Amino acid sequence: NVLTNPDMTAGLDAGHFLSRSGNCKTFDDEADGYCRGEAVVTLILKRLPDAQADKDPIQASILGIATNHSAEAASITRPHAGAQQDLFQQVLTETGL
């Protein structure tokens, strides 16, 4: 994510997505939007037995992953807590934890 198009910022502010005060203040009582950031990240993945047999350095293991949609939200952009709870429960049960 590299931001260089002013139109994207203008259109995100026209949609009341971005805060006009400062950074993202999550859990704060005065949260009024998010801030646009940049970052590039790359990871190397491999099945655990293949990494162990290769003497590769391992620093974490992914146990499960899932995706769904909040299609029951009041609006397209608005989130839906029920869908998120179902996703979390599904991943937890599948992972066995």
Add this chain to the structure above:
Amino acid sequence: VSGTGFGCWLHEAGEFDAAYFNMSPREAPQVDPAQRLALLTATEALEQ
């Protein structure tokens, strides 16, 4: 400035049924015709 101006075009790319898809006359022209055509074709395929 391009050197070629040919291509095969969709001449009904701007046609949409806003009322069917709970859209508004001011919102509709702001939606990329790709999304509108995707909606139309997906609905037709599902009904077919």
Add this chain to the structure above:
Amino acid sequence: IGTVWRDALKILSEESGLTDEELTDDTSFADVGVDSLMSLVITSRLRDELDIDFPDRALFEECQTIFDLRKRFSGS
């Protein structure tokens, strides 16, 4: 209330791009296509110009149809 209601209906028709022929009492805000995103613009313009009190809840949530919006505007 009459002048405020007429100006509000004009504002709603402008932002929605509808006629005021079909933006009647029976009209449902969902069928019109007003999201929370658009209701925010409606309420912001409304407060800025007409000076009416529609904070923190927009219109589509509490007011399902034009009936509810008109009732809220009447200040009954």
